[PDB]
Amino acid sequence: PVLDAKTAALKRRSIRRYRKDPVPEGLLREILEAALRAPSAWNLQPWRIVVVRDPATKRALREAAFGQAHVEEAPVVLVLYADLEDALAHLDEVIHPGVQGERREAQKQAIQRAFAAMGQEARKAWASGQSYILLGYLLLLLEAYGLGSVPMLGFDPERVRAILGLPSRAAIPALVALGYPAEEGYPSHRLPLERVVLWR
Amino acid sequence: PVLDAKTAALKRRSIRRYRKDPVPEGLLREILEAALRAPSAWNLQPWRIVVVRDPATKRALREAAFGQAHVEEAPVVLVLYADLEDALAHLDEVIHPGVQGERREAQKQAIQRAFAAMGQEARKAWASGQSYILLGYLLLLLEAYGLGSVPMLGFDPERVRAILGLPSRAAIPALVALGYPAEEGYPSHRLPLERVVLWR
Numbered sequence: 001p002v003l004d005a006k007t008a009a010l011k012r013r014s015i016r017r018y019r020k021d022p023v024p025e026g027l028l029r030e031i032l033e034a035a036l037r038a039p040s041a042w043n044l045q046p047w048r049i050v051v052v053r054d055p056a057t058k059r060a061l062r063e064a065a066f067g068q069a070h071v072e073e074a075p076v077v078l079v080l081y082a083d084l085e086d087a088l089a090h091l092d093e094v095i096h097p098g099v100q101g102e103r104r105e106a107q108k109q110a111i112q113r114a115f116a117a118m119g120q121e122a123r124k125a126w127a128s129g130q131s132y133i134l135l136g137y138l139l140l141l142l143e144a145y146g147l148g149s150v151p152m153l154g155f156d157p158e159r160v161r162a163i164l165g166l167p168s169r170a171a172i173p174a175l176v177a178l179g180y181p182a183e184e185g186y187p188s189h190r191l192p193l194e195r196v197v198l199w200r
Numbered sequence: 201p202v203l204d205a206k207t208a209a210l211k212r213r214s215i216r217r218y219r220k221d222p223v224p225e226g227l228l229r230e231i232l233e234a235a236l237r238a239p240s241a242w243n244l245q246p247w248r249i250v251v252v253r254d255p256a257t258k259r260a261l262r263e264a265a266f267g268q269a270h271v272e273e274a275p276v277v278l279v280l281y282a283d284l285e286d287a288l289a290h291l292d293e294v295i296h297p298g299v300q301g302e303r304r305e306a307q308k309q310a311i312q313r314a315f316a317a318m319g320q321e322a323r324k325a326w327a328s329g330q331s332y333i334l335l336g337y338l339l340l341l342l343e344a345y346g347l348g349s350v351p352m353l354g355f356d357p358e359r360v361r362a363i364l365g366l367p368s369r370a371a372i373p374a375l376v377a378l379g380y381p382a383e384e385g386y387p388s389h390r391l392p393l394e395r396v397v398l399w400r
């Protein structure tokens with residue numbers, strides 16, 4: 001009974017306490033397959049995910065996340081990383097299958113030229129930005145399936161790269177702890193609509 | 201009959217041709233109120249939205265977006281901008297209402313200190329990243345309500361800032377054209393799950 005998207009967005013709160021029940025791999029795969037349909041500029045999809053269930057690795061990530069207890073307690077921690085260089089080395093995988101021959105090359109050169117003119121920090125920030133569209137899809141879908149989650153930026157990226165063996169060029173836009181909820185979550189407010197939106 | 205979140209994510213395609221029917225302001229406000237419940241680091245919510253319906257302004261934005269015709273043809277264009285300095289000047293609006301007295305100050309100083317040590321480009325990229333979580337929520341909700349959309353980065357940000365009178369420090373993570381669909385949209389692929397996800 002997956003929830004409608006409006007109820008999911010209005011009811012979500014971050015959850016930091018979880019039941020001890022495992023999350024079935026079949027259920028996780030259905031959620032990730034739907035979240036990976038998120039759109040990105042030029043269909044580049046620079047996002048990459050590590051699903052961490054091993055207890056020793058979760059304990060190591062808890063230390064990298066300044067001791068946040070939910071990293072170790074949740075049944076599953078997702079590491080969302082962005083690898084622009086892996087995307088650019090495999091551009092034929094993201095170009096539309098109908099766009100072939102000479103059209104494919106012109107699209108591929110325009111993309112390579114745009115990124116050849118950018119530094120390492122700018123590339124990481126661009127690929128991280130696109131990865132946050134996928135994060136928005138994933139948080140709404142986790143709520144719609146009845147799972148709780150907390151996205152995190154409070155961690156040392158150098159330690160996370162070392163524990164998992166990630167490339168030095170990768171950016172890590174978030175860790176996400178998830179599982180079946182054992183708490184309601186705290187009420188949080190948002191700015192009034194009229195403070196954020198201007199009508200023209 | 202808002203769609204369930206899984207069907208919305210799996211069926212969405214970008215739409216670039218629209219009917220001439222207007223989008224009622226009451227319907228737009230319900231969608232934006234649900235999308236503005238997206239989460240952000242420290243609840244900072246650095247996103248700001250301009251709803252553009254004026255025909256002359258849409259024509260000016262079409263030129264700024266290198267002539268993309270859907271900017272002028274859609275009934276509504278949303279301009280998503282990020283203003284980190286406006287968020288930091290009003291930190292009392294985002295701090296939890298129960299966190300008062302001395303606790304409020306310690307939270308506010310930690311936030312101000314983190315951003316005082318960053319340059320203008322880094323601040324814009326950080327606020328743009330958080331704004332893409334809201335973009336993910338908004339694209340899924342527009343599909344769930346039966347509207348079509350296309351998010352865009354193909355535009356000159358200096359021209360958009362001038363047309364709307366935005367601050368020089370603002371980043372513009374996307375323009376979004378939307379309306380009732382007049383086309384099915386093109387089929388697009390995503391990478392295989394096993395290419396993007398590693399199980400540990």
Ligand SMILES: Cc1cc2nc3c(=O)[nH]c(=O)nc-3n(C[C@H](O)[C@H](O)[C@H](O)COP(=O)(O)O)c2cc1C
Pocket residue numbers: 012013014015068150151152153154155173174185186188238239240241242243333
């Ligand atoms: C990108 C990002 C990073 C965040 N980092 C942390 C974190 O490191 N630890 C934590 O407990 N919550 C963290 N949060 C949770 C946010 O504080 C929270 O989403 C926000 O206060 C609104 O609360 P809600 O998610 O309950 O609606 C983060 C959220 C996002 C979107």
Ligand SMILES: Cc1cc2nc3c(=O)[nH]c(=O)nc-3n(C[C@H](O)[C@H](O)[C@H](O)COP(=O)(O)O)c2cc1C
Pocket residue numbers: 038039040041042043133212213214215268350351352353354355373374385386388
């Ligand atoms: C941040 C962003 C910027 C994009 N910019 C443009 C644009 O300037 N013009 C356009 O026609 N489509 C643009 N697109 C649409 C993308 O090409 C498209 O989302 C992707 O090819 C997958 O197609 P789908 O959205 O139909 O699933 C953009 C998408 C995103 C997410």
